[PDB]
């Protein structure tokens, strides 16, 4: 039962295609539970300013009815079985999935296909979803980690589609009409943009058969014969700064440019962020840890927490960190944070690299436990690579990294580049831009 023999016994994945072009995938593990949903390609990036907030307004009312289950009759039909429902949305993604008992599978698929294919934009139920939204905005204006990650997208993509937010400006929402919600759902809702996936007790052959029955009249042709095309959009070094001198703590983030989805540089950029680490004030043995940040900020009491984030897209990325801090300690966190970035593209030791490879291998196995996680990985792989990547392949990429491979890929992305910076009050200490920019090169090497 060596770790070697267990990877290549995981069940594989089957993929098929329809005449319309829709893709159907599955997996089976012999247990009494299933999960099914649809993943689709849309998001806020894809939208002109006159439609900045549109796509968040449709997800908000998919469960409020349809044409054949007029309103309350829909959620009273899922509750009697004992099942759940969900929906989220990002810049480039949107989901609709269900979670039920294995023998209700033909019933579950009926309810999904009835929603994405023909939904009922009832008037007079518009003008009421609006008031929930307007007041939804202010409750998450008091969340401080969500307004700082909204700035950093607005200062590093200054004149771009990828800068505008998910839920839209507060004035577009007050005059966004009913007629405008029918064209967003007619242009971006069509095969092959959708994916149909499932994991659990499901069997492929009958999953395919039900797909014929319920998705035979789904439009596949694009409107006007128009097909979207991205632009490898630009990145700039820029700053943003808000004072607020009556809040107890300060929030700060900072980033450079990164790879895309399909770039082969990503793997050795994970092995290097796991060397920096994470921390929070309620850990145990936090003067005794292995981290440059971790073991110093606990002996002197500098911070509450810190983390490292890599965001990725089709054409642009991000690479950085976030910390929350006192007001008399802001520029001892910059001084120590940057001294670790340079120390890694300069000499960087060997034993430090086997430990960071072990971490990244546990975070992969641990995550895929459940039926919601495995199913959510299947339907996102398709829209980003094709060919869902087996676990045997993720491990022979990690067998390649060395100490020298890390030093090159850090220099290419970190040394002598321009950052973007965001800050939220009370900050006066936060140093000037001319002095953050001079910490990106040791004057010796």
């Amino acid at each position: 039962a060596t770790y070697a023999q267990a990877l290549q016994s995981v069940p594989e994945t089957q993929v098929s295609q329809l005449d319309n072009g829709l893709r159907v995938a599955s997996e089976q593990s012999s247990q009494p539970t299933c999960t099914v949903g649809v993943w689709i390609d849309a998001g806020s990036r894809y939208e002109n300013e006159k439609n900045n907030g549109a796509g968040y307004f449709v997800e908000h009312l998919a469960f409020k009815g349809t044409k054949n289950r007029p309103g309350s009759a829909l959620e009273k039909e899922v509750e009697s079985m004992g099942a759940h429902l969900n929906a989220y949305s990002t810049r480039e993604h949107t989901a609709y999935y269900i979670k039920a008992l294995s023998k209700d599978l033909p019933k579950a698929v009926e309810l999904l296909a009835d929603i994405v294919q023909n939904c009922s934009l009832e008037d007079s139920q518009i003008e009421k979803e609006r008031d929930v939204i307007l007041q939804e905005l202010q409750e998450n204006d008091s969340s401080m980690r969500d307004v700082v990650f909204d700035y950093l997208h607005a200062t590093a993509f200054q004149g771009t589609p990828l800068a505008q937010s998910v839920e839209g400006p507060s004035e577009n929402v007050r005059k966004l009409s009913r007629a405008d919600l029918t064209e967003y759902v007619s242009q971006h809702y069509k095969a092959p943009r959708m994916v149909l996936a499932a994991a659990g007790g499901v069997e492929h052959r009958q999953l395919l058969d039900l797909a014929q029955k319920h998705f035979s009249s789904l439009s596949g042709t694009y409107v006007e014969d128009a097909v979207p095309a991205f632009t490898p959009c630009r990145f700039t070094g820029s700053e943003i700064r808000h004072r607020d001198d009556a809040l107890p703590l300060a929030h700060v983030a900072i980033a450079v440019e990164g790879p895309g989805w399909a770039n082969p540089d990503n793997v050795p950029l994970q092995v290097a962020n796991a060397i920096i680490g994470h921390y929070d004030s309620t850990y145990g043995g936090g003067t005794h840890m292995s981290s440059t940040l971790a073991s110093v900020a606990a002996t002197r009491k500098l911070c509450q927490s810190f983390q490292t984030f890599n965001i990725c897209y089709a054409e642009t990325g991000l690479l950085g960190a976030h910390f929350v801090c006192d007001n008399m300690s802001i520029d001892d966190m910059m001084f120590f944070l940057q001294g670790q970035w340079m120390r890694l593209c300069t000499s960087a030791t060997e034993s430090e690299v086997v430990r960071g490879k072990n971490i990244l291998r546990n975070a992969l196995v641990s995550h895929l436990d459940g039926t919601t996680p495995v199913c959510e990985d299947i339907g996102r792989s398709l829209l980003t690579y094709g060919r869902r990547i087996p676990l045997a392949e993720w491990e022979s990429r990690i067998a390649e990294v060395d100490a020298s491979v890390v030093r090159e890929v850090c220099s290419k992305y970190f040394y002598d580049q321009c950052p973007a910076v965001a800050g939220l009050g009370p900050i006066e200490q936060l140093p000037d831009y001319n002095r953050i920019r001079s910490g990106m090169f040791w004057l010796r090497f």
């Binding site: 000499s347 960087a348 030791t349 060997e350 034993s351 090497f445």
Partner: protein, 49 residues
Amino acid sequence: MLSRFLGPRYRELARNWIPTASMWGAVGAVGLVWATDWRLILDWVPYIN
């Protein structure tokens, strides 16, 4: 006494700091001939007499 520099990883990092230093003598050899007006070294170079 002085074994606090003598370790498996500590001996490695020298190769990370010789490429910087092994040049750092060429700066002095050139710059000295600039400053003190060395003649013997200046008589090896044909551009400058």
